[PDB]
Amino acid sequence: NSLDRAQAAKNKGNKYFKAGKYEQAIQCYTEAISLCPTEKNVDLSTFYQNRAAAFEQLQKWKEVAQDCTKAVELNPKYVKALFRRAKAHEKLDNKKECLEDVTAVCILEGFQNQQSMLLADKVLKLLGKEKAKEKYKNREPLMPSPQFIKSYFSSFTDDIISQPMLGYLKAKQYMEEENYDKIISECSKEIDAEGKYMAEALLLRATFYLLIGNANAAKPDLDKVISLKEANVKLRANALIKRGSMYMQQQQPLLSTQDFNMAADIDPQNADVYHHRGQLKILLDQVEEAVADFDECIRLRPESALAQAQKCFALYRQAYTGNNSSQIQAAMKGFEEVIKKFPRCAEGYALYAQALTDQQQFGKADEMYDKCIDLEPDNATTYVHKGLLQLQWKQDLDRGLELISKAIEIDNKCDFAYETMGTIEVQRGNMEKAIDMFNKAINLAKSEMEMAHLYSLCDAAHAQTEVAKK
Amino acid sequence: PIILRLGSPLSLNMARKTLNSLEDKAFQLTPIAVQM
């Protein structure tokens, strides 16, 4: 009965444990370690894990990881020992080791334990945020394509800075000639000389700071345009739109809405404010606030195809969230009415295809994406949409890779496509090629938040290969 | 976690939420996750 003597020592250590006498419980567990036959892996791993619990209440995290480690050697799939070591590594700032332990925990649990997944999600965000910060320091900025720049400014009508010409004047001519890399220089000459186009150059320089991914240099310019009350209200409203979007990009919903609300108050008929705020309201699932902004866009732009396509999709999300099939079909038929009234609005088809995919009509959604290729053949994002469709629809990873690769041929500076290709290589099991695609998107991401998400995908991939080695 | 992309249409920003969901399932549907 040599094993009964080990459990007897373990059971008295449990009574010291419940009385708060952890040092005396540790000695009983140590006595149980000695009396357990080496042939009994499970019982011996139990005794090590119990002693790690006593070390945990004393908050001696080093001894916790040590005892959990020995317990895993006897019971390699001891989920309680692996998870306790993951918590121990978190306290010791062993984030990579904590991620690897909690990765094995989630796999053994079938991803069914919210407690384990919250810990993995917590350490993944921290690891990705750290690397995104250090990489964003000395990252060289890339100027996006002219097609992206013109599409960005075409989403504004009241910005002034994009208007044609009838320091800053030289910057406006470099812009009309698509020589964007020298716009920031000529704008600084106005600000340094404090000319009459000072607020415009301050706003135009901040815009291209954002366009090259330098949100840290755009913030002081946006702050300054907003502080100048004498400046044109159109320039302050446009600067508040861009500072609010940057706030939302940095996970600041409250400051974002404050800037958008102030933009609407100081410039009540600026349709850019209602257009860009409503798009954020949809992303935040604040639907009734979105239709209100999109209804104002229609009121201010009664002939705009996109404005009615927006509101039609906003009405759909309202029916989708309330789950009335009568209202859902009402808004679904509204899409077919929008595409007939505006047959060359590609976003009308894309918003419809999203609603079709949300409601399982994949074949018709692929047709709407095909129509976008007819109208706009050089739009790479539509091929990303078709690729994402092939994953949700048929799980055809080969055809999905070909469509995502097609978007790269059109726009090799599309970080969204590289992220989708790495996601596919994870699903196929090619972890090294997946990290390869994630890194190419990192060097292309436009914000630090996007870069942190991509770095998290890398650490999750690397952690799985380490778990695979055992 | 709203990952907002600069200068993108609404349909593209909607696809980010779809990509996030597909990334979660991709890591749960890897050879190492099923063989353990």
Numbering used by the authors:
A (entry chain C): 109 to 274, 297 to 600
B (entry chain B): 43 to 78
Lines quoted from the article behind this entry:
Orf9b is a unique accessory protein of SARS-CoV-2 and SARS-CoV. It is implicated in immune evasion by targeting mitochondria, where it associates with the versatile adapter TOM70. TOM70 is a multifunctional protein anchored to the mitochondrial outer membrane. It is a surface receptor of the translocase of the outer membrane (TOM) complex, the gateway of protein import in mitochondria.
We determined the crystal structure of the hTOM70 ΔN2/SARS-CoV-2 orf9b complex to 2.2 Å. One copy of TOM70 and one copy of orf9b are present in the asymmetric unit, consistent with our stoichiometry assessment. While the majority of hTOM70 residues were visible in our final structure, we found a central portion of SARS-CoV-2 orf9b (residues 43-78) was bound to hTOM70, but the remnant of orf9b was disordered. The visible portion of SARS-CoV-2 orf9b adopts a helical conformation: The N-terminal region of the fragment folds into a “U-turn” shaped loop that is followed by a long, slightly bent helix and a short helix; the C-terminal region of the fragment extends towards the proximity of hTOM70 NTD. This is in stark contrast to the β-sheet-rich conformation adopted by the same fragment in the orf9b homodimer. Using PISA software, we calculated the buried interface area between hTOM70 and SARS-CoV-2 orf9b of ~2000 Å2 and the solvation free energy gain (ΔiG) of −33.8 kcal/M. Owing to the high resolution of this structure, we were able to identify extensive interactions between the two proteins: (1) Polar contacts include 12 potential hydrogen bonds and 7 potential salt bridges, involving 10 residues of hTOM70 (from α13, α19, α21, α23, and α25 helices) and 11 residues of SARS-CoV-2 orf9b. Of note, multiple salt bridges (distance 2.7–3.3 Å) were identified between E549, H583 of hTOM70, and R58, E65 of orf9b, suggesting their importance in the interaction. (2) We identified 23 non-polar residues on the surface of the CTD pocket interacting with SARS-CoV-2 orf9b. Comparing the structure of hTOM70/orf9b complex and the unliganded structures indicates that the binding of orf9b induces evident conformational changes, which includes movement of the bridging helix outward or downward compared with the corresponding helix in yeast TOM70 or TOM71 structure, and the bottom helix is pressed down by the N-terminal portion of the orf9b. Collectively, we identified a highly flexible region of the CTD-pocket of hTOM70 associated with orf9b binding. By occupying the CTD pocket, the orf9b may lock the conformation of hTOM70 into a rigid state.
